[PDB]
Amino acid sequence: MAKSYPTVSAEYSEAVEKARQKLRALIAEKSCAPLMLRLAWHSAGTFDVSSRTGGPFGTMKNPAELAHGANAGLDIAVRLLEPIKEEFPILSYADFYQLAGVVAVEVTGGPQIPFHPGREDKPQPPPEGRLPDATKGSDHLRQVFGKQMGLSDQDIVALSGGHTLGRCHKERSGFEGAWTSNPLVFDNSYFKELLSGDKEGLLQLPSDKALLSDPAFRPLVDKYAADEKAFFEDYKEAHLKLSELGFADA
Ligand code: HEM
Ligand SMILES: O=C1O[C@H]([C@@H](O)CO)C(O)=C1O
Ligand code: NA
């Protein structure tokens, strides 16, 4: 009941469905689901509840936001999706990029995340610096996800499981390597790899390791490593919330 979703026209809803189908095909065909999940996450994760600035309002299309250090490489994602966007002028970029994130999770075998249309494309990007620093720990994660975004500790741990997709690139973040052996499969392997410690061929960031040492995050890591269904449920809820920060709030 925290949300009151806006009414959109039947044509808007039809465009959502047709764009979803084109996104599902392209993301699968081009093997770019991890980059697209990151696109949606960096689009949404800048929301700060105290000023109601940032969040999933299409501003990743803005070159000034693409230029933020944390967004290196997301220009590729924007460009890859633009041919589809051109076919759906009625859709906001805000909705389109969140839809791409939902589809990325779907096509890699993850949960089906509800999608509600109607986000506006806002003119101003957030200030740079809202997104989490991979070198920091649990206090920082709580400031970013909790105090800025308004998400719970459960959401932090579940959403960290997005690292089951993809990898770090030395020219983008400067880190290098994948968290899992199957970076195109959405599963609970991220948590299993965390629990087993570091191993040759896989990467863990300090922000990932903070989940193991924190007394509230660690039981969630244990739960998700043992129970993929519980992970998918909590991930679905967290991703839904993330994708709607600042949007349709009652
Ligand atoms: C918890 C705090 C987080 C930190 C510190 C963090 C940090 C990073 C870093 C440094 C990269 C590498 C970027 C590159 O070099 O290409 C990355 C990639 C990625 N992140 Fe996170 N991230 C966090 C949370 C999230 C969340 C919440 C999601 C989505 C639910 C997510 C999804 C991804 C994905 C899918 C990639 C791989 C992208 C690719 O393979 O192109 N991350 N993250
Ligand atoms: O997930 C990704 O997709 C592309 C490439 O791997 C396939 O298009 C890209 O650069 C990634 O980070
Ligand atoms: Na994986």
Side-chain angles (χ1 to χ4, degrees), residues 30-36 38 73 76 80 166-167 169 172 184:
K30 297 189 185 298
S31 296
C32 57
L35 181 64
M36 304 294 172
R38 181 179 170 239
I76 300 162
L80 279 173
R167 69 188 68 250
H169 305 79
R172 301 187 187 164
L184 290 175

Side-chain angles (χ1 to χ4, degrees), residues 23-180:
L23 285 165
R24 284 185 172 140
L26 178 144
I27 292 173
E29 282 155 17
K30 297 189 185 298
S31 296
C32 57
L35 181 64
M36 304 294 172
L37 178 55
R38 181 179 170 239
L39 172 66
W41 144 235
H42 283 204
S43 287
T46 60
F47 187 67
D48 191 328
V49 303
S50 294
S51 58
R52 297 188 78 72
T53 58
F57 300 106
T59 56
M60 213 35 86
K61 179 65 180 172
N62 189 308
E65 182 162 355
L66 285 169
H68 293 182
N71 291 331
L74 291 182
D75 55 352
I76 300 162
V78 164
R79 289 186 289 259
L80 279 173
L81 295 189
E82 198 70 36
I84 292 171
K85 182 66 178 74
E86 292 158 353
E87 316 170 38
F88 299 102
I90 204 180
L91 296 179
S92 61
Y93 282 93
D95 277 353
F96 182 68
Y97 295 153
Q98 291 311 307
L99 185 61
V102 162
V103 170
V105 173
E106 180 189 34
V107 304
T108 56
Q112 162 189 174
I113 301 153
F115 182 77
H116 304 107
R119 298 158 186 73
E120 85 167 275
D121 282 338
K122 289 186 190 187
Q124 299 308 318
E128 183 166 4
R130 298 253 170 105
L131 292 168
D133 184 329
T135 71
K136 293 187 183 166
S138 66
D139 287 353
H140 177 69
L141 293 172
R142 290 190 172 88
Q143 164 65 35
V144 172
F145 286 88
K147 302 310 146 323
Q148 296 163 203
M149 296 183 228
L151 298 173
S152 72
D153 286 4
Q154 179 183 289
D155 295 332
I156 293 172
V157 183
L159 289 170
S160 307
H163 288 164
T164 185
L165 296 188
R167 69 188 68 250
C168 287
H169 305 79
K170 193 170 276 173
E171 77 278 8
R172 301 187 187 164
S173 65
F175 289 93
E176 178 173 89
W179 294 267
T180 67

